[PDB]
Write a protein that holds these residues in place. Structure first.
Motif, PDB file in Angstrom:
ATOM      1  N   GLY A   1       1.043  -5.142   8.149  1.00  0.00           N
ATOM      2  CA  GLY A   1       2.274  -4.284   8.341  1.00  0.00           C
ATOM      3  C   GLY A   1       3.332  -4.897   9.367  1.00  0.00           C
TER       4      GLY A   1
ATOM      5  N   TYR B   1       6.124  -3.342  11.627  1.00  0.00           N
ATOM      6  CA  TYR B   1       6.860  -1.979  12.260  1.00  0.00           C
ATOM      7  C   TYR B   1       8.029  -2.370  13.114  1.00  0.00           C
ATOM      8  CZ  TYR B   1       2.692   0.672  10.722  1.00  0.00           C
ATOM      9  OH  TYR B   1       1.768   1.349  10.038  1.00  0.00           O
TER      10      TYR B   1
ATOM     11  N   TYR C   1      15.042   2.852   9.242  1.00  0.00           N
ATOM     12  CA  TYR C   1      15.905   3.437   8.440  1.00  0.00           C
ATOM     13  C   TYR C   1      16.121   4.973   8.702  1.00  0.00           C
ATOM     14  CZ  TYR C   1      12.339   4.990   5.330  1.00  0.00           C
ATOM     15  OH  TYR C   1      11.099   5.454   4.843  1.00  0.00           O
TER      16      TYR C   1
ATOM     17  N   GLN D   1      12.322   6.395  10.116  1.00  0.00           N
ATOM     18  CA  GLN D   1      10.959   6.009  10.255  1.00  0.00           C
ATOM     19  C   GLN D   1      10.849   4.290   9.771  1.00  0.00           C
ATOM     20  OE1 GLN D   1       9.536   6.433   6.095  1.00  0.00           O
ATOM     21  NE2 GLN D   1       7.229   6.361   6.704  1.00  0.00           N
TER      22      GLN D   1
ATOM     23  N   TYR E   1       9.454   0.874   8.262  1.00  0.00           N
ATOM     24  CA  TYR E   1       9.122   0.366   7.027  1.00  0.00           C
ATOM     25  C   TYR E   1       7.544  -0.289   7.232  1.00  0.00           C
ATOM     26  CZ  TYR E   1      13.420   0.634   4.423  1.00  0.00           C
ATOM     27  OH  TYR E   1      14.600   0.902   3.774  1.00  0.00           O
ATOM     28  N   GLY E   2       6.961  -0.487   6.031  1.00  0.00           N
ATOM     29  CA  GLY E   2       5.541  -1.122   6.154  1.00  0.00           C
ATOM     30  C   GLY E   2       5.377  -2.417   5.660  1.00  0.00           C
ATOM     31  N   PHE E   3       6.412  -3.327   5.876  1.00  0.00           N
ATOM     32  CA  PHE E   3       6.374  -4.435   5.245  1.00  0.00           C
ATOM     33  C   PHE E   3       5.047  -5.454   5.419  1.00  0.00           C
ATOM     34  CE2 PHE E   3      11.141  -4.580   5.389  1.00  0.00           C
ATOM     35  CZ  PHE E   3      11.362  -4.199   4.063  1.00  0.00           C
ATOM     36  N   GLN E   4       4.676  -5.991   4.097  1.00  0.00           N
ATOM     37  CA  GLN E   4       3.471  -6.620   4.302  1.00  0.00           C
ATOM     38  C   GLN E   4       3.670  -7.515   2.936  1.00  0.00           C
ATOM     39  OE1 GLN E   4       0.047  -4.145   3.958  1.00  0.00           O
ATOM     40  NE2 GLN E   4      -1.383  -5.823   4.360  1.00  0.00           N
TER      41      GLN E   4
END
Ligand SMILES: *[C@@H]1O[C@H](CO)[C@@H](O[C@@H]2O[C@H](CO)[C@@H](O[C@@H]3O[C@H](CO)[C@@H](O)[C@H](O[C@H]4O[C@H](CO)[C@@H](O)[C@H](O)[C@@H]4O)[C@@H]3O)[C@H](O)[C@H]2NC(C)=O)[C@H](O)[C@H]1NC(C)=O
Lengths: 116, 195, 108
Positions: free
Chosen positions: B115, B117, B121, B161, B163-166
């Protein structure tokens, strides 16, 4: 936004299946469409996925049979199946997503397909 | 020839977060959009008004460069006259906007195992957002009838919040580097011109 | 992947109820992208929450979801007589969406 699909209803086993989902008062463009089915007496069941750019992501155990295509101009989504099984009877929905980071928002009425 | 520093914009080491978009002023330089159009390194290239073919022989006064990274499915919310969570709470474009929007896939830069973090946004806003407005406030948004008192709780939510980029995400749920250029002409003599 | 939900809960109008969605593959993170949908009689479906907290502007404010511990949960505040339904949680695991078993909600 309304979604309508037409299904054959009764198909013989080991025969092709074609379901078309239509959109009213909207446009496909960059909106994903998900296909979800639910056998009677049970829970939901994921089938596949098509993205806005045309890429697709199918169920692992059904990639050999499934096939998803769509037409931007005519504004329809197609689902194709081959070598149907007696268990492959359920209510088939086409699901759309809105513009608030929420997928599985707009659904259809649901078409019923039985194989015998 | 003092070329416009477009390279430091497209190829910057890091880009700005969705809610806090950075604005850069471009003036007293010469640009060349033919290379930008013919590069074909951008996934998305669409815009209205001026044409890329005839953009070379056009003189303006000020050029604005904006940077932010969002998911793949949100790129359509950066069109004129569009409504969405981004266009309502994070970044709104005017109806009479002129300029062009550039977007390309950036999985290989902002996606980390476990992830990411780092990017955020705006989640909720008290009202709608004026075009070309930026908000940095982190005050607890209130969606009820009781004061939040600055402490998180029932009906008191953080307006931001992460994002959960992966690298294992989907096609439309992947980072997208987006830069939008604004062209303005004023009563002052034009300074930004073509080759 | 296997995800599980509570069979059914009993609720009276006025108070708050929390509905969870537990994944047996590990602790749910932000990256799971939990979505919630609603079941109504005559086979009527409606989506409520995306990205685990992105409420739609048309959805009433009584619906709110977040992550608590290792399970994603949905919170309803001030249940009404029109809130009986079945709720499904959809998670993004591997490369295929995973649905839950459903949770039937009854209002007294
Ligand atoms: C991709 O397609 C496949 C093909 O259908 C699909 O697999 C299906 O998954 C469901 C979900 O588990 C299976 O349903 C199970 O069926 C068994 C009998 O074989 C039941 O015993 C199971 O019930 C248990 O779980 C229930 C809760 O859900 C409990 O209430 C119950 O008491 C049992 O503990 C369960 O219903 C189904 O059999 C398979 N189909 C096949 C052909 O194996 C898969 O889900 C699709 N992909 C995705 C991501 O959904």
């Amino acid at each position: 936004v309304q979604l309508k699909e037409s299904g054959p209803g009764l198909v013989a086993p080991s025969q092709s299946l074609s379901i078309t989902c239509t959109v009213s008062g909207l446009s496909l463009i960059g909106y994903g469409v998900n296909w979800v089915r639910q056998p009677p007496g049970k829970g939901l069941e994921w089938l596949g996925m098509i993205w806005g750019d045309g890429s697709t992501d199918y169920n692992s155990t059904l990639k050999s049979r499934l096939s998803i295509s769509k037409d931007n101009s005519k504004s329809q989504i197609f689902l194709k199946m081959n070598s149907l099984q007696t268990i492959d009877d359920a209510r088939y929905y086409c699901v759309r997503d809105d513009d608030y980071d929420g997928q599985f928002a707009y659904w259809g009425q649901g078409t019923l397909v039985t194989v015998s | 020839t003092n070329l416009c520093p477009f390279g430091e914009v497209f190829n910057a080491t890091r880009f700005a977060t969705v809610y806090a978009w950075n604005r850069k002023r471009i003036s007293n330089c010469v640009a060349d959009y033919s290379v930008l159009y013919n590069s074909a390194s951008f996934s998305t290239f669409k815009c209205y008004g001026v044409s890329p073919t005839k953009l070379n022989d056009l003189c303006f006064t000020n050029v604005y460069a904006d940077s932010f990274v969002i998911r793949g499915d949100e790129v359509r919310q950066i069109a004129p006259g569009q409504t969405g969570k981004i266009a309502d709470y994070n970044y709104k474009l005017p109806d009479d906007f002129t300029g062009c929007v550039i977007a390309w896939n950036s999985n290989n830069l902002d996606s980390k195992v476990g992830g990411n973090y780092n990017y955020l946004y705006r989640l909720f806003r008290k009202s709608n957002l004026k075009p070309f407005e930026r908000d940095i406030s982190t005050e607890i948004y209130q969606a009820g009838s009781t004061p939040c008192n600055g402490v998180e709780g029932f009906n008191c939510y953080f307006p931001l919040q992460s994002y959960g980029f992966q690298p294992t995400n989907g096609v439309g749920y992947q980072p997208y580097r987006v830069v939008v250029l604004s062209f303005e002409l004023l009563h002052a003599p034009a300074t930004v011109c073509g080759p | 992947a296997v995800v599980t939900q509570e069979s059914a809960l009993t609720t009276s109008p006025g108070e708050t109820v929390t509905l969870t969605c537990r994944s047996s593959t590990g602790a749910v993170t932000i990256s799971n992208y939990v979505n919630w949908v609603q079941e109504k009689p005559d086979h009527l479906f409606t989506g409520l929450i995306g990205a685990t907290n992105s409420r739609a502007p048309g959805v009433p404010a009584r619906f709110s979801g977040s992550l608590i511990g290792d399970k994603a949960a949905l919170t309803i505040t001030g249940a009404q007589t029109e809130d009986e339904a079945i709720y499904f949680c959809a998670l993004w695991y591997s490369n295929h969406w995973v649905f839950g078993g459903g949770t039937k909600l009854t209002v007294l």
